[PDB]
Amino acid sequence: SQLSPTELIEMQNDLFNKEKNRQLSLTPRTEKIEVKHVGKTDPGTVFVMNKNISTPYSCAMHLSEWYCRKSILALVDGQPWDMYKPLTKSCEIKFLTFKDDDPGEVNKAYWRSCAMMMGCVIERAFKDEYVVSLVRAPEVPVIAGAFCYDVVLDKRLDEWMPTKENLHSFTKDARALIYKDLPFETLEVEAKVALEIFQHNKYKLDFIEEKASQNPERIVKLHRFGDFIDVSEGPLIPRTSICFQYEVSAVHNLQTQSSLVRRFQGLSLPVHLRAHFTIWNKLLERSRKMVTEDK
Amino acid sequence: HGKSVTWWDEHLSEENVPFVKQLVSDENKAQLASKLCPLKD
Amino acid sequence: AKKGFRAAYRFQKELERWRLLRCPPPPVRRSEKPNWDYHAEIQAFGHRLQETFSLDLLKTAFVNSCYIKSEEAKRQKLGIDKEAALLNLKDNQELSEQGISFSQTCLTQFFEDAFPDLPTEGVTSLVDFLTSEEVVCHVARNLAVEQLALSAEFPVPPPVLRQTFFAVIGALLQSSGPERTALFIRDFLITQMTGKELFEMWTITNPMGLLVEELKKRKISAPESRLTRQSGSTTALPVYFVGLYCDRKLIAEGPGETVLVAEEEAARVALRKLFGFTENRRPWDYSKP
Amino acid sequence: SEKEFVEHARKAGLVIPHERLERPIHLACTAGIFDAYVPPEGDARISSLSKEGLAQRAERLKKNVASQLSIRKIRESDPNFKIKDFPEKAKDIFIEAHLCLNNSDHDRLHTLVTENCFPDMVWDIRYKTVRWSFVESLEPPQVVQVRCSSLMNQGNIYGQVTVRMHTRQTLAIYDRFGRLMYGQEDVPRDVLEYVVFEKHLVDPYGSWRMHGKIIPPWAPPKQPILKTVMIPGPQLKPWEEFEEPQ
Amino acid sequence: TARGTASRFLTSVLHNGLGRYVQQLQRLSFSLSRDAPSSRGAREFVEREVTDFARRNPGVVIYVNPRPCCVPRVVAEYLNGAVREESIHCKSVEEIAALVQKLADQSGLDVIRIRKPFHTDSPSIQGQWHPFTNKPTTLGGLRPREVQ
Amino acid sequence: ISHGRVFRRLGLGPESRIHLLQNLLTGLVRHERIEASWARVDELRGYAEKLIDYGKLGDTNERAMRMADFWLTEKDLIPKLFQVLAPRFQGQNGGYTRMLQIPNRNEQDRAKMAVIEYKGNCLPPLPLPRRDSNLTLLNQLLQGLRQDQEASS
Amino acid sequence: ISRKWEKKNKIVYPPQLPGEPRRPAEIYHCRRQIKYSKDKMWYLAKLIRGMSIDQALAQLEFSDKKGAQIIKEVLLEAQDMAVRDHNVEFRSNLYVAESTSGRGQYLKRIRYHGRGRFGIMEKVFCHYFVKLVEGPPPPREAPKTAVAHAREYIQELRNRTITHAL
Amino acid sequence: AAPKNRRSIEVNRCRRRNPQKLIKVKNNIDVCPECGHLKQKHILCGYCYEKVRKETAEIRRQMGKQEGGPFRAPTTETVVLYSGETPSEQDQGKRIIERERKRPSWFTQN
Ligand SMILES: [Mg+2]
Ligand SMILES: [Mg+2]
Ligand SMILES: [Mg+2]
Ligand SMILES: [Zn+2]
Known part of the structure; x- marks a missing residue:
């Protein structure tokens, strides 16, 4: 199709906005939900929130700005929950930070957010005449030294590999993206609308299909910050500016029988957990190596 | 963004501090040993 | 207690003035x-x-x-x-x-x-x-x-x-x-x-485009931009003078901070000279015919 | 050098000055409501039918002996007392009281409502903007019961009349900063209350003043607040451990 | 004091006097009294000279108001929207006439210091001086110590 | 010029400082944990460490006995010092006391205060500053580095 | 005396038209006759100017000044008033717009020196005024950059005119 | 020495508004992970320390109630137990304090 990348971005944003408007119009009235605070700090706290409008970020604002600054993830009584996803029913909320006793869920959320940011940088850092298709974000554990993202490039781009200058340019683009604060928004959609949202990336369509297959209700979780829309598992961090240290470590071209995919590995640390210069250098050196964990 | 001051020992764990100290000590020892023969490089 | 009314009335006028200054009333119809x-x-x-x-x-x-x-x-x-x-x-x-x-x-x-x-x-x-x-x-x-x-x-x-x-x-x-x-x-x-x-x-x-179109209408081939005088090139505030030559004849000149701005100003001056709207033109005639 | 501060505000009341008052305090109304009418829970469904509500409202007013004796006492105390002409006057009084509260006309509001009703309708609203209007009346107001309390110590008889009112009202309460707080001004929401009026029979003037506003226990909950409300928990001392109720 | 007060340039309203002259005085309202001795001059001026002045200048709306006032006043409102209020308290008929003529001849602008006694639009006829208007051009436009 | 000085000036002189330190040490021995000024606690830490070493020399050591007699003003603590603190501090070499800075006193002086505590006491544990768990992001990255280093050998 | 900071909180605004931006809520509070010194209280007031309410409370908690506790209590009372009386949600979405300290009625006593000499000693009292505005704190003003300085210098050079020329 | 002339308000402001005399903002403020109150990174939490101080004061008050004299100090180790607890084999033979309060969460058996 004869579509400019900016036109594709505009169409995706318009369709996402239409879906959000439909979700908002699904609730005609403002229902009151009584949410308990099950956190260790202030037990028994009660919040009278608006149904499908109020957010755990708003609950943190009601509590104090310290909760907004520290807490990244919300546990709504059975599951992790991002700060900018509206609550549905009456429940209990527990806030989760980076320095908690079991921060693993927050670490996964930060890992996925960093992978999505790297994919957003990669998709728009390439020339328009070339074709770039994001495949997915392979969930590698925190033990692995770098978050990985899979990208399929044009056929004529299969010869060259990005150099140190290209990696530094990618890092500068990521830092520029971080400098502007872009909240992460999570929207619950169906495969029927996700297919028309993406409509161009075959790998993304396959990912949507395989993610909807395991869901009986055909529900696909979409995340959007700024003008970038992507599908990923679980919640994400509320703010981009939480990422303080950010580096694009390396790239590894893995060749299969059907196509060859560039796996970009990058390293990042949040503002709360920033490390020393030598420690960061050692972590980057470790992340330079190949990471292979898909199942 | 009122960021707080952070030192290298604030965010480390009990088991990691000796590991960091060793990873610095052996790296410095290797760097010093590398330059021990300047006339042949 | 100071016995007097002139001072009180004058201070009332001053209070009215201060109130008017503090809160300006909305404009009212004449x-x-x-x-x-x-x-x-x-x-x-x-x-x-x-x-x-x-x-x-x-x-x-x-x-x-x-x-x-x-x-x-x-x-x-x-x-x-x-x-x-x-x-x-x-x-x-x-x-x-x-x-x-x-x-x-x-x-x-x-x-x-x-x-x-x-x-x-x-x-x-x-x-x-x-x-x-x-x-x-x-x-x-x-x-x-x-x-x-x-x-x-x-x-x-x-x-x-x-x-x-x-x-x-x-x-x-x-x-x-x-x-x-x-x-x-x-x-x-x-x-x-x-x-x-x-x-x-x-x-x-596009002063240059308008000038070349007007010259084409007036049967003139093309204007050439030539640097006549300049004052400083590596300075923080360079000054350039660009003149327009048609058949090696200067028709207009323009100053500028940069060469492009000077060329645009020269084109504007040439256009004004061609159209007759010049600072040295005839003043508008205000008389009774 | 010997100078001290003055004007220390303190509110200390004693029984001796209260009992040594030369003149007793004049009261234009009683404290509260003596006999509170308990409506049946099926009124919401009964209101769907016209005659099935009107016949019951007429029958209940006549079958009660206390209401009939109270009406008879009111009639013998003051002539030209008609029950049939009462609901229109009560409706007009309620409408004018709401208009006066909207207009912040405290004098006319005092003339209409009584001293036990004015604070409850002025206290939390004196610093806010009210936009109330009257659009329609689904059901005419109906006189349910009439009560009278006689105090023989001063020889004072106070008569209160209870009228069920089903009204269609639009309410919009703004904030002191100009932003909307409670509800929209174009929604004609339906309400059902019981207005209890009070009138002093011994007083030669004896104006009808609204005294109480009874709401049924089974009434639907009020509309949600536009803002979000946070309820703090119990403040715990360092030596006190928290107890989670279940 | 120039540093203490405001200032303005020599300007004319709506380029008056270029195409035609327009009297900038729009309305003139006298407020006087019939019994106050201070209003003798205003009363005599209204009796004698106000009709002749109105005939001479038809473009100004003249209002006269006798009222129980102690300070006879004259308010002149100009086409600029400016309002200038003066006191005619205990002044002779000649002084009143002189003040009225002065107000009529005034343009209604602010009476402050004028920075320049002249105002010419585009005074750069035949050119304006620049440091290159008197320096001869060398062959090829070369710098003094530049070799081609 | 205060170069090469290890003793700080307290009280009304050297003897006054010695008496104040002796009283603080007696209180620390009696209560197993005390709180005082930060400088006073820091100065008393060395004497508290030395007292345990003297007590570990044995009950029959006359030098240790007379040292305890001089320092511990309350003579009921000397048997306690020689039969409770010394026996429970045997394998420990120099980890006898713990000192932690507490917030400033609520009095108008706003002095900088510390708390000293003998280890292994029968008192509720102080809110010690605990390190971050290994499950944190940076700690997990360091664990991965450690695993890679172990696998490299 | 004068009492206008208390009455400034009793003003009522007309209802906002549909489509106008939401006007942020403003709450004025003041503490009268504080034993603290005027300049010492002014230092604390200047410390928390333009900062968020939570950060100001955190700084006042560890501040060793005697008036720090008084200002913290004043801020807590102002926040409680904003939550309860005013229609202000997100109690942590307030920032200190203005924080000022003035003097009040002093007490005069005699302070002896010697040789029969004495001076006038002024037991001082101070008043603290605070204004809280709903919304995120305004950003701090960064120092002027070199490009902005160059732009200003070029504009100043270009705005010149030949004085006393015509 | 006496001043020669009155110092102006501009000079006074320039003297007593310098950043040296201004209060510096402290960036070491943090929240306690246990009770959620404010504390500094190098200082113990005030709330938790107050809890510990209250518990220690109660324990010492009871252990001094046990000893009827000022110079009657135990010659052996001491152990404090709460309601619903019994001394173990390793805790036997030592002085025993018994509290009606239950064992706090922060206080470990050990
Ligand atoms: Mg003497
Ligand atoms: Mg003096
Ligand atoms: Mg003095
Ligand atoms: Zn704590």
């Missing part, structure tokens, strides 16, 4: 102010311009549709019958349209006879600038047309002010002669162009 007489104001406005208007035409021109609608709303809210006289106010729409048309035609003819080399787009831009909201509203406010205009919203937005001014123009055209109306237009709208520049109101985008 008609709503006590000293007012509409017929005397109309006669004074007619006599002050050395013109002979018609009182009925001026009263027709000084009423507005918004004022009529406000009066009708008040009539409906009060429950009184006003259809006998309020409906026969004879809105100034026709007078305003006639004034706009006559003013545009007269200004176009004036500019065509004064500057034959001005293009159609240039003369249209000049006419639109002279008939624009800012100039017309400024003229009406200086002539106290706003005070005599019967309309709600005493600020009298620029569209209402322009409509009233052109209704007055049309009333003058209908009452007096077309020559007298043209003289009035020349005296009260062209004088606003004194000391102004053609480009300040034309706002062209």
Whole structure:
């Protein structure tokens, strides 16, 4: 199709906005939900929130700005929950930070957010005449030294590999993206609308299909910050500016029988957990190596 | 963004501090040993 | 206790002044102010311009549709019958349209006879600038047309002010002669162009392109931009002079901070010289033929 | 050098000055409501039918002996007392009281409502903007019961009349900063209350003043607040451990 | 004091006097009294000279108001919208006439210090001086120590 | 010029400082945990460490006995010192006391205060500053580095 | 005396038209007759100017000044008033717009020196005024950059005119 | 020495508004992970320390109630137990304090 990348971005944003408007119009009235605070700090706290409008970020604002600054993830009584996803029913909320006793869920959320940011940088850092298709974000554990993202490039781009200058340019683009604060928004959609949202990336369509297959209700979780829309598992961090240290470590071209995919590995640390210069250098050196964990 | 001051020992764990100290000590020892023969490089 | 009333009254005046400074009241209508007489104001406005208007035409021109609608709303809210006289106010729409048309035609003819080399787009831009909201509203406010205009919203937005001014123009055209109306237009709208520049109101985008098109029309091959003089190249504030040569003959020159700006200014100077709108041109003739 | 501060505000009341008052405090109304009418829970469904509500409302007013004796006592105390002409006057009084509260006309509001009703309708609203209007009346107001309390110590008889009112009202309460707080001004929401009026029979003037506003226990909950409300928990001392209720 | 007070340039309203001259005085309202001795001059001026002045200048709306006031005043409102209020308290008929003529001749602008006694639009006829308007051009436009 | 000085000036002189330190040490021995000024606690830390070493020399050591007699003003603590603190501090070499800075006193002086505590006491544990768990992001990255280093050998 | 900071909180605004931006809520509070010194209280007031309410409370908690506790109590009372009386949600979405300290009625006593000499000693009292505005704190003003300095210098050079020329 | 002239308000402001005399903002403020109150990174939490101080004061008050004299100090180790607890084999033979309060969460058996 004869579509400019900016036109594709505009169409995706318009369709996402239409879906959000439909979700908002699904609730005609403002229902009151009584949410308990099950956190260790202030037990028994009660919040009278608006149904499908109020957010755990708003609950943190009601509590104090310290909760907004520290807490990244919300546990709504059975599951992790991002700060900018509206609550549905009456429940209990527990806030989760980076320095908690079991921060693993927050670490996964930060890992996925960093992978999505790297994919957003990669998709728009390439020339328009070339074709770039994001495949997915392979969930590698925190033990692995770098978050990985899979990208399929044009056929004529299969010869060259990005150099140190290209990696530094990618890092500068990521830092520029971080400098502007872009909240992460999570929207619950169906495969029927996700297919028309993406409509161009075959790998993304396959990912949507395989993610909807395991869901009986055909529900696909979409995340959007700024003008970038992507599908990923679980919640994400509320703010981009939480990422303080950010580096694009390396790239590894893995060749299969059907196509060859560039796996970009990058390293990042949040503002709360920033490390020393030598420690960061050692972590980057470790992340330079190949990471292979898909199942 | 009122960021707080952070030192290298604030965010480390009990088991990691000796590991960091060793990873610095052996790296410095290797760097010093590398330059021990300047006339042949 | 100081026995006295003059000091108390003077301090009351001072307190009123301080209150006025602290909280400025919204502007009020001159008609709503006590000293007012509409017929005397109309006669004074007619006599002050050395013109002979018609009182009925001026009263027709000084009423507005918004004022009529406000009066009708008040009539409906009060429950009184006003259809006998309020409906026969004879809105100034026709007078305003006639004034706009006559003013545009007269200004176009004036500019065509004064500057034959001005293009159609240039003369249209000049006419639109002279008939624009800012100039017309400024003229009406200086002539106290706003005070005599019967309309709600005493600020009298620029569209209402322009409509009233052109209704007055049309009333003058209908009452007096077309020559007298043209003289009035020349005296009260062209004088606003004194000391102004053609480009300040034309706002062209490609002076070089317009210049080369004009030279092609005038049978000139192409202008060449050549650096005549300059003052500093590595300095923080360089100065350049770029001249335009046609057949190795200088036609215009322009200064600038950078070479591109100097070339654009030289093109603008050449265009102004070709069109005749120059600082050394003939001043506008204000006489009685 | 010997100078001290003054004007220390303190509110200390004692029984001796209260009992040594030369003149007793004049009261234009009683404290509260003596006999609170308990409506049946099926009124919401009964209101769907016209005659099935009107016949019951007429029958209940006549079958009660206390209401009949109270009406008879009111009639013998003051002539020209008609039950049939009462609901229109009560409706007009309620409408004018709401209009006066909207207009912040405290004098007329005092003339209409009583001293036990004015604070409850002025206290939390004196610093806010009210936009209330009357659009329609689904059901005419109906006189349910009439009560009278006689105090023989001063020889004072106070008569309170209870009228069920089903009204269609639009309410919009703004904030002191100009932003909307409670509800929209174009929604004609339906309400059902019981207005209890009070009138002093011994007083030669004896104006009808609204005294109480009874709401049924089974009434639907009020509309949600536009803002979000946070309820703090119990403040715990360092030596006190928290107890989670279940 | 120039540093203490405000200032303005020599300007004319609506380029008056270029095409035609327009009297900038719009309305003139006298407020006087019939029984106050201080209003003798205003009363005599109204009796004698106000009609002749109105005939001489038809472009100004003249209002006269006798009222129980102690300070006779004259308010002149100009086409600029400016309002200038003066006191005619205990002044002779000649002084009143002189003040009225002065107000009529005034343009209604602010009476402050004028920075320049002249105002010419585009005074750069035949050109404006620049450091290159008197320096001869060398062959090829070379710098003094530049070798081609 | 205060170069090469290890003793800070307290009280009304050297003897006054010695008496104040002796009283603080007696209180620390009696209560197993005390709180005082930060400088006073820091100065008393060395004497507290030395007292345990003297007690570990044995009950029959006359030098240690007379040292305890001089320092511990309350003579009921000397048997306690020689039969409770010394026996429970045997394998420990120099980890006898713990000192932690507490927030400033609520009095108008706003002095900088510390708390000293003998280890292994029968008192509720102080809110010690605990390190971050190994499950944190940076700690997990360091664990991965450690695993890579172990696998490299 | 004068009492206007208390009455400034009793003003009522007209209802906002549909489509106008939401006007942020403003709460004025003041503490009268504080034993603290005027300049010492002014230092604390200047410390928390333009900062968020939570950060100001955190700084006042560890501040060793005697008036720090008083200002913290004043801020807590102002926040409680904003939550309860005013229609202000997100109690942590307030920032200190203005924080000022003035003097009040002093007490005069005699302070002896010697040789029969004495001076006038002024027991001082201070008043603290605080204004809280709903919304995020305004950003701090960064120092002027080199490009902005160059732009200003070029504008100043270009705005010149030949004085006393015509 | 006496001042020669009155110092102006501009000079006074320039002297007593310098950043040296201004209060510096402390960036070491953090929240306690246990009770959620404010504390510094190098200082113990005030709330938790107050809890510990209260518990220690109660324990010492009871252990001094046990000893009827000022110079009657135990010659052996001491152990404090709460309601619903019994001394273990390793805790036997030592002085025993018994509290009616239950064992706090922060206080470990050990
Ligand atoms: Mg003496
Ligand atoms: Mg003195
Ligand atoms: Mg003094
Ligand atoms: Zn704590």
